[PDB]
Symmetry: C6
Subunit: 134 residues, 6 copies
């Protein structure tokens, strides 16, 4: 059987996105709303635009597929998707939306800095976390 | 029926204004007080001034109409306050904020700020920078 | 009757000063002490100095007149518990009027009318922004 | 009868020092320790040094006499405030100069009178 | 018996690493995940890379052995002791090598003394922002 | 009897060190650990190094002698931390800081902090003075 890593073609790995703690990522609702707010025109375009655009299109739709099945169930069902699957798509949606805004290299440097920073005990950790920028 | 977007002639949309959370926008009272404090002479002027001015005039007046109708109900006949706060109040808080800010700072500056804040406030407290984006020229 | 605006000859209006919330203005006492600390020699001078000085003098004097009446009312009102409500009227209603006026004239003399007016609007906009969005540092008055 | 202002020969007044609130000034003890720590050799010198030194000498000695008399707490706040202003005024002038001390006094007095909603987070400071 | 200092060939000492308080160092887990996130390609490489890489390889593995042994006590027959005493040893060692690989030996050492002096200053006198790495 | 000031040959006084409040100085333990971490090789050297080194050697040793005696109940510990403990916390801090930053820097910082911490909170600047080369 196959083992495909969604981030490998984009220069990262599943293990790398997991270096960021689970409570770092915005909610799925807030990420989808931002993909719309920032990239709706391109996401709906007939042009490919970029591999990030192509991947982001499918991620949005797939979460739609998971939600349409969960909402057709009825509460206990919706909890399973949000608990298990939810973090997976919060990393994926965050990765692609951030890469489109700031660039892939900039996103990866930020990911490591934050992961090291958030892991430093509070007694020693600098007051300002690293920030993302161009 | 028609489908008119009040922000479309100004290069924005309802969905775009709604990217800002409900507790971002000032009160209805504080925005009207600011429209007067900043633009009374022009808002009351016989000149058009600008499409923002023309639109801003109608919004203030409309909220006047909405308030008079709801007040004439209570004065001449409580859940109506709940309905207004949920539905109508936010709609006009977004509209008054959009036009007053656009008049002061320019439309491009307002839109860039709207997306930055909408992204910033959506970042969990563990990761978001301490100071939010600011509006300026 | 007439309709006189104390701020009209100074390039502002009552509505404009009220754009600042009541808790923005210092106390009447602290404003009188600052007029004294900064401008006593001129306030007591036989020269006009400036229209702000002429107006500031009368406001100080007028607040004195209002104070003498309240203190005469306190000493001469048999109704004891009612004096608390009578003293409250001055601090609640008339006090704010003179806190705006004394602040306007003292600040205009120090920083200039333009600087005062621009600062007033920036603060009025800033204090009205909900805490989630407004910058931590309010605008400041300076030259 | 006479009406002598301790600050008048030094270019200020009693009313001016009182423009600073009561909780601005350090304690009397903390000012005396500082007068010693900064100027002990000059205060104890047989040379005049400066009118600020001459005045500061008498204030310290006077405060000692006032302390013996008490050993009323409200009175200690009244006379104590008078000497907290005086000891602070003369020590600060010796360090930073009279003009610098006076501009700081008014800047701070206006600043602390601004309600918390409007006053800048960082107060005015003394500097050389 | 011998008296080998793991830090001596790297230009430091045990006494120097212990100048940092116990609550300064991240957890063993957070340090291992960082070694993986930052260097796992090099740690797993057949090339020496550097003496730090060689030492970091052995430390990670040794902590593996210590965990297997303490965990075998619960499964086959304590673990708390391994968390406290040996844990601090490997929290210092893993932090030293990961930090040296990222920032350099001199930078790591200067920071260590500055922080040790800073954290020892009573709160009344010490500056609000601790020293940082660069 | 004599009247010896440990700080006099170093250009300071007991009164000046006491201008710093008692809660300014690190613990006795943290100062000894810092002397070791920063200067162990010199403290143990057969060379003089400097008069600061010579004094710091004797102070450390003296605290050892004093500690054995005190550990030889809450009132004895209160007395030691109040009188003798502060004495060596000032001394160990003075010499370690002078070795690191220089005597002038230490003395200027001491007066600045002594005035700063004596300022009431309403007027005192947010950021305290710091030591620096
Ligand atoms: C993001 N960032 C930028 C640095 F350039 C500035 N900086 N300086 C320090 C820290 C930072 C920091 O977080 C955190 N820190 C520390 O020791 N982190 C750490 C070291 C090795 C590890 F293996 C792991 Br896990 C965590 C204290 C000093
Ligand atoms: C305004 N602003 C701009 C940057 F210049 C500074 N900056 N750096 C970070 C953040 C900011 C920031 O707030 C927020 N953040 C983060 O991950 N945001 C985020 C990312 C993608 C999304 F799809 C969504 Br929804 C939210 C942590 C790093
Ligand atoms: C003083 N000041 C100067 C700006 F240059 C910096 N700045 N940026 C923002 C804010 C400020 C600010 O307070 C406040 N704010 C906001 O939306 N205010 C607002 C806008 C329109 C209105 F009609 C009303 Br009422 C209030 C968030 C963004
Ligand atoms: C020290 N300092 C420096 C200024 F350069 C900066 N600054 N800007 C403001 C303030 C300051 C400030 O405190 C305080 N403030 C205000 O209205 N003060 C005030 C004004 C008139 C009065 F008669 C009295 Br009484 C108090 C808000 C704006
Ligand atoms: C990291 N850092 C940078 C300094 F360059 C600036 N700085 N200035 C001070 C402090 C610092 C500081 O911590 C802390 N401090 C102090 O007295 N520390 C201290 C001194 C000698 C000792 F033996 C021990 Br133990 C602790 C108050 C003044
Ligand atoms: C360290 N430092 C640097 C100054 F250069 C800046 N600075 N400005 C002020 C203060 C400082 C300050 O602490 C403290 N302060 C004040 O009045 N202190 C004081 C004055 C005379 C005394 F005799 C005593 Br006792 C205490 C308010 C103004
Ligand atoms: Cl778009
Ligand atoms: Cl942060
Ligand atoms: Cl107008
Ligand atoms: Cl903010
Ligand atoms: Cl005057
Ligand atoms: Cl503020
Ligand atoms: Cl002296
Ligand atoms: Cl302050
Ligand atoms: Cl890797
Ligand atoms: Cl910190
Ligand atoms: Cl050493
Ligand atoms: Cl501090």
């Amino acid at each position: 059987s196959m083992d495909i890593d969604p981030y490998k073609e984009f220069g990262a790995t599943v293990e790398l996105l997991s270096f960021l703690p689970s409570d770092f990522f915005p909610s799925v609702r807030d990420l989808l709303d931002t993909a719309a707010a920032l990239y709706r025109d391109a996401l709906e375009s007939p042009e490919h635009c970029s591999p990030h655009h192509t991947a982001l299109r499918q991620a949005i739709l797939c979460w739609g597929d998971l939600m349409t099945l969960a909402t057709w169930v009825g509460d206990l069902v919706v909890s399973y998707v949000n608990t298990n699957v939810g973090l997976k798509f919060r990393q994926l949606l965050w990765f692609h939306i951030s890469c489109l805004t700031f660039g892939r290299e900039t996103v990866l440097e930020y990911l490591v800095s934050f992961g090291v920073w958030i892991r430093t005990p509070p007694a020693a950790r600098p007051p300002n976390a690293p920030i993302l920028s161009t």
